[PDB]
C-alpha cells in the first residue's frame, strides 16, 4: 500500500497544502525561502534519476531525508507571541517522510519528486509568498 500513486498525487498535494496553518489575516505561514533547499535537492534528484541507476542514488535520497527532517525542525515563525513551524506542518500534512520511505526505484523517486512539484505549485497558487 503506497500513499503516492500516479492517479492521486496532485489532488493529495491540493488537500495537503489547503490544510496548512494560516495567520489570522489569512496568509500562509510557510514561505518559499524556507523550502528552497529542499526544492533544489528534489529537482537535482529528479534530474539525476533519468541518467544514473537507482543504486547510485542511494545517498542522495538519504541526504534529502535528513535535510527534510532538519528543515522541519529548524524553521520557526513567531507571530502574536505564538511560534509555529511551517516546514514541519507541511511535512506532516503532506506525509513527506512516509512517501520518502516508499522510494525504492526510479519510478517511486520520480513520483515523489513530481509530488513535491505539485505541492509547491499549489502552495504558490493559494497565495504563498517567496
Amino acid at each position: 500500500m503506497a500513499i503516492l500513486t500516479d492517479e492521486n498525487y496532485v489532488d493529495k498535494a491540493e488537500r495537503a497544502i489547503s490544510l496548512l496553518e494560516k495567520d489570522n489575516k489569512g496568509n500562509y505561514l510557510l514561505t518559499t525561502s524556507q523550502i528552497r533547499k529542499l526544492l533544489s535537492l528534489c529537482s537535482s534528484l529528479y534530474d539525476r534519476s533519468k541518467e544514473r541507476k537507482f543504486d547510485e542514488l542511494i545517498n542522495d535520497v538519504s541526504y534529502l531525508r535528513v535535510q527534510f527532517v532538519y528543515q522541519s525542525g529548524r524553521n520557526s515563525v513567531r507571530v502574536n507571541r505564538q511560534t509555529f513551524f511551517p516546514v514541519k506542518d507541511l511535512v506532516e500534512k503532506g506525509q513527506i517522510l512516509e512517501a520518502l520511505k516508499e522510494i525504492k526505484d526510479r519510478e517511486t523517486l520520480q513520483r515523489f519528486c513530481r509530488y513535491m512539484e505539485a505541492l509547491v505549485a499549489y502552495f504558490k497558487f493559494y497565495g504563498g509568498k517567496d
Binding site: T32, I35, R36, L39, S40, S44, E117, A121, K124
Partner: protein
C-alpha cells in the same frame, strides 16, 4: 587546397558563469536567473552564439581601424572570419563555432559537489536608506570544463591569409581570457581559461606545427 583545421580546447571556468536562458528548464519553485541548459541532461552549456558574439565584439575593438555601428560595418579581416550578410565576398565565414558542453562532471562529483549549478545570493543596498533588496543568480560551478571546438576552413581564398586568420583567432581567444564570457561579469563572473589549446587538421593536408607552437607557448 581545401582543408579544415579544428582548434580544440578546454574552457575551464575561473569563476561561475551565468550565460542565462529562459524558464524552459527552470525549477518549479525557483525564483532564479536560470542559465542556458541542455534540454535532456539539464546541464549548463556554453552556446556557440555567446562565444562568437563576445569574441566578435572584442575583436572589433582591435581589428577595425574605424568604429562600426553594426556587425555589417565590420572590417574585412573580421568579416571574412565571422561572416557578413551585406557582403557577397564574405557572406559565409571561415569560422564555425560549436556549443560547448560540460566535460568533467565526473571530476566535479569526485570533488564532492551535489549539483553542477549553484545559486549565488546578492543584494543591492540603498545608499540613502540602507535598505537591501536581494536576488538569486544561477551560475555554473567554478571548476567546470567545457569541450571547445572551433573549425577553420581553408580554400583558395585563403591563399595568403591563413597566417593572419590564425593570429586573429589567437587574439580573440586571448581577449576572451582577459574578458568575461556573457553574464554579470562586471561583478566578477564568467572568467574563463583555454587549456590544451591545439589545432588539428581534421580535413585535407595542412601543416599546423608552427601554429601549434604559438598555441601551446604563447597561448
Amino acid at each position: 587546397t581545401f582543408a579544415k583545421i579544428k582548434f580544440s580546447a578546454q574552457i575551464r571556468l575561473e569563476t561561475g558563469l551565468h550565460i542565462g536562458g529562459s524558464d524552459a528548464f527552470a525549477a518549479i519553485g525557483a525564483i532564479d536567473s536560470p542559465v542556458i541548459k541542455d534540454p535532456i541532461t539539464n546541464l549548463p552549456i556554453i552556446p556557440g552564439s555567446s562565444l562568437k558574439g563576445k569574441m566578435r565584439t572584442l575583436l572589433a575593438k582591435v581589428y577595425n581601424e574605424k568604429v562600426a555601428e553594426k556587425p555589417s560595418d565590420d572590417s574585412d579581416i573580421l568579416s571574412r572570419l565571422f561572416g557578413n550578410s551585406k557582403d557577397k565576398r564574405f557572406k559565409m565565414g571561415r569560422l564555425i563555432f560549436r556549443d560547448a558542453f560540460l566535460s568533467n562532471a565526473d571530476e566535479l562529483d569526485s570533488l564532492g559537489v551535489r549539483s553542477y549549478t549553484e545559486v549565488k545570493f546578492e543584494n543591492t543596498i540603498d545608499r540613502i536608506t540602507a535598505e537591501a533588496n536581494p536576488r538569486q543568480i544561477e551560475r555554473a560551478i567554478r571548476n567546470s570544463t567545457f569541450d571547445f571546438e572551433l573549425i577553420y576552413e581553408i580554400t583558395d581564398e585563403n591563399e595568403n591569409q591563413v597566417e593572419e586568420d590564425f593570429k586573429v583567432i589567437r587574439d580573440g581567444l586571448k581577449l576572451l581570457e582577459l574578458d568575461y564570457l556573457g553574464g554579470s561579469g562586471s561583478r566578477g563572473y564568467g572568467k574563463v581559461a583555454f587549456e590544451n589549446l591545439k589545432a588539428t587538421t581534421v580535413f585535407g593536408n595542412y601543416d599546423v606545427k608552427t601554429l601549434n607552437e604559438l598555441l601551446t607557448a604563447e597561448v
